[PDB]
Structures are given as C-alpha cells and as structure tokens.
Design a protein around this ligand. Sequence first.
Ligand SMILES: OC[C@H]1O[C@H](O[C@H]2[C@H](O)[C@@H](O)[C@@H](O[C@H]3[C@H](O)[C@@H](O)[C@@H](O[C@H]4[C@H](O)[C@@H](O)[C@@H](O[C@H]5[C@H](O)[C@@H](O)[C@@H](O[C@H]6[C@H](O)[C@@H](O)[C@@H](O)O[C@@H]6CO)O[C@@H]5CO)O[C@@H]4CO)O[C@@H]3CO)O[C@@H]2CO)[C@H](O)[C@@H](O)[C@@H]1O
Ligand SMILES: OC[C@H]1O[C@H](O[C@H]2[C@H](O)[C@@H](O)[C@@H](O[C@H]3[C@H](O)[C@@H](O)[C@@H](O[C@H]4[C@H](O)[C@@H](O)[C@@H](O[C@H]5[C@H](O)[C@@H](O)[C@@H](O[C@H]6[C@H](O)[C@@H](O)[C@@H](O)O[C@@H]6CO)O[C@@H]5CO)O[C@@H]4CO)O[C@@H]3CO)O[C@@H]2CO)[C@H](O)[C@@H](O)[C@@H]1O
Ligand SMILES: OC[C@H]1O[C@H](O[C@H]2[C@H](O)[C@@H](O)[C@@H](O[C@H]3[C@H](O)[C@@H](O)[C@@H](O[C@H]4[C@H](O)[C@@H](O)[C@@H](O[C@H]5[C@H](O)[C@@H](O)[C@@H](O)O[C@@H]5CO)O[C@@H]4CO)O[C@@H]3CO)O[C@@H]2CO)[C@H](O)[C@@H](O)[C@@H]1O
Ligand SMILES: OC[C@H]1O[C@H](O[C@H]2[C@H](O)[C@@H](O)[C@@H](O[C@H]3[C@H](O)[C@@H](O)[C@@H](O[C@H]4[C@H](O)[C@@H](O)[C@@H](O[C@H]5[C@H](O)[C@@H](O)[C@@H](O)O[C@@H]5CO)O[C@@H]4CO)O[C@@H]3CO)O[C@@H]2CO)[C@H](O)[C@@H](O)[C@@H]1O
Length: 208
Amino acid sequence: GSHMMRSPYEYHHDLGMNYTLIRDELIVGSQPQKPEDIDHLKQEQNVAYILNLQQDKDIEYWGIDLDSIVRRCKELGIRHMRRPAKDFDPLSLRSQLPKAVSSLEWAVSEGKGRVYVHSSAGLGRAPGVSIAYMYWFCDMNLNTAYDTLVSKRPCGPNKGAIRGATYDLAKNDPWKEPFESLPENAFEDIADWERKLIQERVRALRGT
Ligand SMILES: OC[C@H]1O[C@H](O[C@H]2[C@H](O)[C@@H](O)[C@@H](O[C@H]3[C@H](O)[C@@H](O)[C@@H](O[C@H]4[C@H](O)[C@@H](O)[C@@H](O[C@H]5[C@H](O)[C@@H](O)[C@@H](O[C@H]6[C@H](O)[C@@H](O)[C@@H](O)O[C@@H]6CO)O[C@@H]5CO)O[C@@H]4CO)O[C@@H]3CO)O[C@@H]2CO)[C@H](O)[C@@H](O)[C@@H]1O
Ligand SMILES: OC[C@H]1O[C@H](O[C@H]2[C@H](O)[C@@H](O)[C@@H](O[C@H]3[C@H](O)[C@@H](O)[C@@H](O[C@H]4[C@H](O)[C@@H](O)[C@@H](O[C@H]5[C@H](O)[C@@H](O)[C@@H](O[C@H]6[C@H](O)[C@@H](O)[C@@H](O)O[C@@H]6CO)O[C@@H]5CO)O[C@@H]4CO)O[C@@H]3CO)O[C@@H]2CO)[C@H](O)[C@@H](O)[C@@H]1O
Ligand SMILES: OC[C@H]1O[C@H](O[C@H]2[C@H](O)[C@@H](O)[C@@H](O[C@H]3[C@H](O)[C@@H](O)[C@@H](O[C@H]4[C@H](O)[C@@H](O)[C@@H](O[C@H]5[C@H](O)[C@@H](O)[C@@H](O)O[C@@H]5CO)O[C@@H]4CO)O[C@@H]3CO)O[C@@H]2CO)[C@H](O)[C@@H](O)[C@@H]1O
Ligand SMILES: OC[C@H]1O[C@H](O[C@H]2[C@H](O)[C@@H](O)[C@@H](O[C@H]3[C@H](O)[C@@H](O)[C@@H](O[C@H]4[C@H](O)[C@@H](O)[C@@H](O[C@H]5[C@H](O)[C@@H](O)[C@@H](O)O[C@@H]5CO)O[C@@H]4CO)O[C@@H]3CO)O[C@@H]2CO)[C@H](O)[C@@H](O)[C@@H]1O
C-alpha cells in the first residue's frame, strides 16, 4: 500500500532471491530461500559455487533451512562455502574480508562455473566482498571497483572497510601508522608490490 521508504535501499525478502551479474565469473545477490533457488542458479546461470556470508542468527531470523539448501547443492555438484560476517557491522566486514575473498578468488580460479556471492540482502556484505575481489585481483583501483558494482547493483557498501582491509594486508608496521592517522585516500590504490603481497596473503588463507 502507500508507504514512505524506510531507508535508501530496502531488502524485499518477499519478492524472492534477487541477483546481479557483475562480471562473467561473479554474481552478487540475496540469500537463496529454498532448495529450488539453487536449481534456478544451476539451470539459469551455470553457478558452481555459493559463497554465503551470513551468521547463523541471520539464517534463523529469515527462517532458512540451510541444511536442505546445502544438501541440494551437493546433489547438483555445487560447492557451498560459508564465511560469516556480522550484519550492519563494517568493522566485522573489514576483519572477515580477506578470508571471504580467498574463498571467492579460489572458486573463480577453479573455473567450474560461476560463483554466487550472497549475504542476507546482498546490499552490504556480498557487494563489499565482491568489490575487494575486483580491486585486489582484477587490476583496478578501489573507486573503479566500487562503481563497477554499484552501477549494476545499487547499494551503499562501506568503502572505508574495504580500504581498511587493503591497509590491513599491505601496510608495514600498522602500529606506527594507524589507519585513522592517514589521509582519507590512503589505499584507494596500491603499488605493484602491495598488490602482489595482498594476493599472496589472500591465497595463503585458502582452506583455512
Ligand atoms: O557448518 C559450517 C561449516 O563451516 C566450516 O566449513 C566452511 C569453511 O570454514 C569455509 O572456509 C569454507 O571452506 C571453503 C574454503 O573457504 C574455500 O577456499 C575452499 O577451500 C579449498 C581451498 O581453497 C584449496 O586451497 C584447498 O585447500 C587445501 C589447502 O590449500 C592446503 O594448504 C591444506 O589446507 C590446510 C591449511 O594449510 C592449514 O592451515 C589448515 O588450516 O588446514 C587446511 C586444510 O586442512 O589443505 C586444504 C585442503 O584441505 O582445498 C579446499 C577445498 O576443499 O573450499 C572450502 C569448501 O570446502 O566453507 C566451508 C563450508 O561451510 C566448517 O569447517 C565445517 O565443518 C562446517 O560444516
Ligand atoms: O548509503 C545508503 C546506506 O548505506 C548503508 O546502509 C547499508 C547497511 O549498512 C547494510 O548493513 C545493509 O543494510 C541491510 C541489512 O544488511 C539487511 O540484513 C536488511 O536488514 C534487515 C535484517 O536482515 C533483519 O534482520 C532486520 O534487522 C533488524 C534486526 O533484526 C534487529 O535486531 C535490529 O538490529 C539492530 C541491532 O540490535 C544492533 O545491535 C545493531 O546491529 O543495529 C541493528 C539495526 O540497527 O534492527 C534491525 C533493523 O531494525 O531487519 C532489517 C531491515 O532493516 O536490509 C538492510 C537494508 O534495508 O545495506 C545498506 C545499503 O546498502 C549505510 O550504512 C547507511 O547509513 C546508508 O544510509
Ligand atoms: O615510484 C613509485 C611512484 O613514485 C612517485 O609517486 C609518489 C608521488 O610522487 C608522491 O607525491 C606520492 O603521491 C601521493 C600524492 O601526492 C597524493 O596526492 C595522493 O594521490 C592522490 C591524488 O592526489 C588524487 O588526485 C587521487 O588520484 C586519482 C587520480 O587523480 C586519477 O587519475 C586516477 O588515476 O585514480 C586516482 C585515485 O585512485 O588520489 C590519489 C591517491 O588515491 O597519494 C599519493 C600517495 O602515494 O606518493 C607516490 C608514491 O609512489 C612518482 O611520482 C610516480 O610516478 C612513481 O611511479
Ligand atoms: O595530485 C597530483 C599528484 O600527481 C602525481 O602523483 C601521482 C603519482 O605519481 C602516481 O604514481 C599515482 O600514485 C599512485 C601510487 O604510485 C601508488 O603506489 C598508490 O599509492 C598508494 C600507496 O601505495 C599506499 O601505500 C598508500 O600510501 C600511503 C602510505 O602508505 C602512508 O605511509 C602515507 O605516506 O600515506 C600514503 C597515502 O597517501 O596509499 C596510496 C594510495 O592512496 O596509488 C597512488 C594513487 O593512484 O598517482 C599520483 C596521483 O595522481 C605527482 O607525482 C604528485 O606530486 C602530485 O601530488
């Protein structure tokens, strides 16, 4: 009916799982709600991996029977991966970014089909993870990676968290140069050695 918009971006769980193709290897969207959403993704999008960024309490709140989703994945040869991060929490997204990205980049490199990256709405966590991936592993800077995502799938993923994760992986002696004491554009882009260091540390998180 008639209604003021709660916030700038709203999650309409009642409209079913939604998603957006961002690059050919990479889909970002909301939680699959049923085993049938897995079949959809296999049949329509050649998805061979699911990266789920939700906590257990998210999954309980949204009433999802994750065991049956995961069972369907196994039946269809899809690999289902969990890397939880807190909802509405940019410091949690930041802390978990490197592990989440290692799972996504591993899957893309394995090459069996597309990767479906999701959180609850795919408005916060999953877009952040995807933007970090395109920045660190697809030879862009942070602003270009950010716009690649939000121009296709509008939302306000937290840029500071991604930039802060880039610092966490790349900066020598952080205690000497705290993130908060550095110019705001710091680590919006990276030198070649930094890009190589970040990639080595991310790939070394594989299977951890
Ligand atoms: O109930 C929830 C569920 O949660 C846990 O399982 C999840 C797990 O936490 C989560 O990471 C993910 O698992 C993914 C992973 O993120 C992906 O990256 C991918 O892992 C493969 C990896 O990319 C490959 O490199 C390969 O891993 C090799 C390593 O390269 C080797 O070095 C060696 O790793 C060992 C490592 O050196 C040590 O530090 C030590 O940490 O142990 C490591 C392994 O013992 O071996 C591994 C191979 O074992 O192969 C990986 C492919 O298998 O794919 C993973 C998905 O399978 O998602 C999980 C699912 O939610 C929890 O652990 C579950 O029990 C729990 O049910
Ligand atoms: O630039 C625009 C916009 O960008 C940013 O907003 C983004 C936001 O930060 C990001 O987290 C996301 O927001 C999503 C959210 O991730 C989704 O999950 C969905 O939210 C619904 C959620 O799934 C439900 O569980 C429910 O949340 C309830 C909780 O169940 C309650 O417990 C309570 O949680 C509060 C908790 O007690 C506190 O500890 C703390 O965690 O705060 C929590 C909430 O403040 O309340 C919430 C809500 O009342 O219902 C949720 C529906 O609201 O949908 C969200 C989008 O609507 O995506 C955003 C956009 O990309 C930026 O941060 C903003 O400032 C900026 O305006
Ligand atoms: O040897 C490697 C490298 O060394 C030298 O570069 C160093 C610079 O000389 C030194 O000044 C320092 O550069 C700073 C810069 O001073 C500072 O302004 C900041 O740069 C900002 C820009 O000011 C800002 O406009 C924006 O840049 C945009 C850019 O306009 C746009 O064209 C596009 O390409 O993307 C950019 C945004 O991603 O933001 C940047 C920062 O994000 O920060 C710099 C910090 O490093 O440090 C350099 C360190 O190497 C040589 O001059 C150089 O040619 C050598 O290759
Ligand atoms: O505004 C006009 C500006 O233009 C010219 O600078 C340009 C550089 O010459 C050019 O190379 C490019 O800068 C790149 C940079 O080379 C690249 O290394 C990267 O910079 C990163 C650092 O890698 C990263 O470590 C981090 O730097 C921190 C640093 O760790 C910290 O200790 C302290 O020094 O603060 C730094 C933050 O400034 O962050 C930056 C990323 O922000 O990416 C850079 C941006 O693309 O572009 C420069 C600007 O266009 C002229 O040389 C210069 O004199 C003029 O000021």
